[PDB]
Design a protein around this ligand. Structure first.
Ligand SMILES: *[C@@H]1O[C@H](CO[C@H]2O[C@@H](C)[C@@H](O)[C@@H](O)[C@@H]2O)[C@@H](O[C@@H]2O[C@H](CO)[C@@H](O)[C@H](O)[C@H]2NC(C)=O)[C@H](O)[C@H]1NC(C)=O
Ligand SMILES: *[C@@H]1O[C@H](CO[C@H]2O[C@@H](C)[C@@H](O)[C@@H](O)[C@@H]2O)[C@@H](O[C@@H]2O[C@H](CO)[C@@H](O)[C@H](O)[C@H]2NC(C)=O)[C@H](O)[C@H]1NC(C)=O
Ligand SMILES: *[C@@H]1O[C@H](CO[C@H]2O[C@@H](C)[C@@H](O)[C@@H](O)[C@@H]2O)[C@@H](O[C@@H]2O[C@H](CO)[C@@H](O)[C@H](O)[C@H]2NC(C)=O)[C@H](O)[C@H]1NC(C)=O
Ligand code: NA
Lengths: 408, 408, 408
């Protein structure tokens, strides 16, 4: 009764038949190199070159680009007409993308009309808030997923292999195991990253989403080139009245933009630094130069007898996509349906992944049965050009599918 | 001078006298099985069956059930009377559980009265907001504590032992040690989990607590079957006036429910998936099928000579509860006071726990002295039926105590 | 081609030439002691005393002290004058530190004047909100950085060395390595800690920063002894009018303080406990007595042949500060510029740190070249009396520089 399983990434070893162990805490922002000649314990003349290169920790963040945050000024105007409905007249702020209008229609009165207006219960006083002097101040990105990794290269004799190793995963070969164990608590899913310039940025934990009011972090956004998502103005208008005098609008809510309020208490917010940053559609990768952070590296070497590869198996997998639902750029995510054929084993416990161009976006552990299988993989991230493929290890299907856009 | 201590869960070993080590990164949502015949290095005919089963990672979340979130419609009504105080008259919205009333009392005026009202400084115009078309949309739970674990079963020869091993704890036996090391950053204390249907849910990081305004996530709640916690309506009423016309109420605040605002930007929020979910009073357990997450497993085996159990000791403990204060279902928590008797040792460094039905809710490290000790254990979680017992290892007192209800 | 690197904290070992390994999960709030006589495998009479003391986990939090949070009562007053501008008259609330005034100037009317006021379009009705019955309820601190550590002391023979070991770092010596691996998810950067009394506190994840409205957690603050940061009052005033009657002000916004609203739902918030707490300027250190938390300890001992110290090198470093910019007590932080001289190596990969009085606030990994180097170190934390020095390992420059104050 075989119960094949390749979800274990690592090795079985006999401590007596192991020749070298390196165990250390490494600065996350530092590389590490190890070179050694493994010579046979005396009683031979055969040496083996061991060369290990571990690269700096990289962070990869799947994001939704939120566009630009703007600074601006809130202006208030008044438009009065003696007679006629409010829609009968066009107002100065009508061209303003972000405006809030309150109408005082059919409400003219003797002690609130100008001298040329004998109207009672007629016409319109229109109050108008609008944003102007708009200026973009930064680009904002919503964090969907966070993963850290190091590229690990191992030469043992003439064998040479490089792999990108995720934090809390292991590099496995016949003679060398490299495991990385770490934790970082700097960034969280749902955080919003703000980049003010063309070095670093700020983390916002409460960027407005379902309610944006003027004054909030993220209050005035342009998701793309043209078109604002305008904030709410929660305050009230008042029509200030006087005899023989044109009505005057007033607004009693907050008048200070979110950018100004944030900049007035900027020390309340967390900055981060970046090095060698790589923006792609809905993804950002960089190396965090924070030298206070460390991760744990263990390297185990057996010179003569091979490690037992704990995921070794004779099972063979064929893959193709069937369908997809859900969205890229979304915290809710997508589901990729894969048709997976298993041969050479009655059952096989493994993981099927949703990947594109060697980036993984989701994975499902599954016990496959001999023959055809239908496997659903939940994923998050990607962009409109992503074709998510069904993958097993380094092997992927011939095509992938596109997910739908978010925020439709 | 003995200084006995059982807070260390693990073993002392001599690397030469160890026979097998398995070290690997395991998919959190996958089980793992290892079977091997340990044969004596040649020069014997005695083999030992080793059988290790590691089950999928389970999450256990102590929660406070918040009841149902509702969608609804905000309606506005007006009730006018020529004469009499506002309390003299009953208003249509008085049966509505969530209503906001503003009275314009003794404020009648010539240009704001109907034709049959010669009142000046009399009567009442009543403005009334109320919620209607209410519908529950989901069940919400406040996270109090999060713990991950795997069930680990080890057979070595005829010895067979199963234990639930918390992440970052170790399974210890005479011949086998299994340590699990991991980190997960998906859920946080204070997060609110929302389940919309009877598969998965959403994480909210800003569900309203001390201030709920209409439009907030969590704005309209029913903590149990009947009875709403109504949201605030922060906007203002206006009495629109006209000659020979009944006053008309207006409200200038947000009119869109929190559910609609959240659903309009649903991609801003994080989903999670679940498998084999088990709801009990104030607790939820499930297996997260997110195959992207991994933890580290180390297994060490000595075939001949026993491990040194680092927590081995001759101390003996008797336990009983004395008192309790504080609350279940609460982020502030409770304190269990235990009377603990130590014999066979002058002192003993150990942990006393507050547990019920093999779930732990709190623990206190303490150096006990020979004879009686009073130990206070801080805990969080549980429900009204919980009887928290004083526990040491797998041993517990004969009865437990109930904590008080939260939110009284 | 030498590529010296001391960023790896750990050892190379030959598993056959290692004599003892202790591997265990330790209660975070517990100490651990190991004592053993290492005797030569028989065939000698030379023993070595091994004595290891591991102290309880300490948390060190760099913070910005926010001052005291206050409870208070919101009061509303009215001041009317028949004639003259509003600034012509002094109002009762003018001495109140937190007050909100709305003026109804030149708006007198027949049906809204007292009997002695024949004014039309004159004088002033002044509405005044003010806070009174103020009382401090707690001291608040903004988390800037969080680090955990254990003090580790190792005696091997006559060698005795104590070091404070950060979580996820290693103690390295010729014969003993001690590595600590752990994760904790209780506190987060940007959390606000509130201490109500002189034992424990509460965690707030949404303490108001860029917008404080009355009713918010953190709404009424005094950053120091005298001087309040007053909250906004987002509601509206109304002037209630009547014939031959003095105008009466009304306010329709929230009237309940943030302290009362939080205390009304206190079970929604997370408490923490403390032991042996040490407040210093902009820093708090304590031992968390939460016995449910554990970390992983590995101890490796070689009795005869020394470990290969993976950071061993012949490079020599001289250090001095050059300049500084940025702020203490700030989530944005500071940058220390150091002049670093490298000799005895063509290049050296290492870390330069910004430290004061054996507390580190920042670190930069850098490949130094022979001769002079300019290295910028990003840091966070400290206080006005901090002199941040350039440091390498345990070696620091002769002076340090002060950063600027935050929130100016
Ligand atoms: C894993 O979760 C997805 C997400 O769908 C869930 O979203 C949550 C926010 C919550 O509302 C929950 O009720 C909801 O099911 C599941 O996929 C969804 O399945 C439904 C039912 O067939 C479809 O109508 C949705 O279009 C579909 N969405 C996506 C993005 O695929 C999924 O079934 C669940 N389980 C697995 C194994 O993936
Ligand atoms: C651990 O903390 C608890 C909780 O009480 C604390 O709650 C914080 C929010 C903060 O306000 C702090 O000042 C407060 O002490 C402590 O228990 C409390 O102790 C007081 C004093 O005797 C009692 O009046 C409370 O009822 C009690 N509450 C509970 C739930 O027990 C506790 O003393 C402290 N220390 C230990 C060792 O548990
Ligand atoms: C690491 O980041 C600091 C912080 O400055 C950054 O702050 C972010 C919030 C964001 O606005 C980003 O654009 C900004 O650069 C950098 O230091 C700053 O550098 C500028 C440019 O010379 C100076 O004007 C600032 O005074 C200075 N601030 C501080 C506190 O030093 C820094 O350059 C960057 N890189 C490194 C290697 O430290
Ligand atoms: Na208002």
């Amino acid at each position: 009764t075989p119960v094949w399983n390749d979800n274990a990434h690592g090795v079985g070893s006999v401590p007596m038949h192991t020749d070298l162990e390196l165990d250390f805490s490494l600065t996350s922002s530092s590389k590490y190199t190890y070179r050694r000649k493994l010579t046979n314990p005396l009683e031979e003349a055969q040496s083996i070159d061991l060369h290990i290169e571990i690269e700096e920790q990289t962070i990869g963040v799947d994001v939704h680009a939120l566009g630009h945050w703007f600074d601006g000024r809130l202006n208030l105007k008044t438009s009065f007409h003696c007679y006629g409905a409010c829609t009968k007249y066009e107002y100065p702020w009508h061209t303003a993308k972000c405006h809030y209008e309150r109408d005082y229609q059919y409400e003219t009165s003797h002690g609130c009309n100008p001298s040329d207006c004998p109207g009672v219960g007629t016409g319109c006083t229109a109050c108008g808030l609008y944003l102007d002097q708009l200026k973009p101040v930064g680009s904002a990105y919503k964090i969907i997923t966070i993963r850290y990794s190091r590229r690990v290269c191992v030469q043992f004799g003439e064998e040479n292999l490089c792999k990108i190793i995720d934090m809390n995963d292991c590099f496995v070969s016949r003679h060398v195991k490299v495991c990385i164990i770490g934790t970082v608590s700097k960034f969280s899913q749902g955080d919003t990253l703000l980049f003010f310039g063309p070095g670093g940025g700020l983390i916002f934990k409460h960027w407005c989403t379902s309610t944006c009011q003027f004054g909030d972090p993220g209050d005035i956004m342009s998701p793309r080139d043209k078109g604002f998502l305008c904030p709410e103005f929660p305050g009230s208008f008042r029509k200030k009245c006087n005899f023989a005098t044109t009505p005057i609008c007033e607004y009693d809510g907050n008048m200070v933009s979110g950018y100004k309020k944030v900049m007035a208490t900027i020390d309340s917010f967390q900055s981060f630094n970046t090095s060698t940053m790589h923006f792609t559609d809905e993804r950002i990768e960089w190396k965090d130069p924070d030298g206070m952070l460390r991760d744990h590296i263990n390297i185990l070497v057996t010179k003569d007898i091979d490690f037992d590869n704990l995921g070794e198996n004779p099972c063979k997998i064929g893959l193709q996509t069937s369908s997809i639902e859900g969205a890229w750029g979304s915290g809710v995510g997508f589901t990729l349906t894969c048709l997976v054929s298993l041969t050479e084993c009655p059952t096989f416990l493994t993981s099927i992944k949703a990947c594109d161009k060697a980036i993984c976006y989701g994975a499902e552990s599954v016990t496959l049965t001999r023959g055809q299988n239908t496997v659903k993989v939940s994923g998050k991230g990607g962009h409109s050009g992503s074709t998510f493929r069904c993958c097993h290890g380094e092997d992927c299907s011939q095509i992938g599918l596109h997910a739908a856009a978010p925020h439709l």
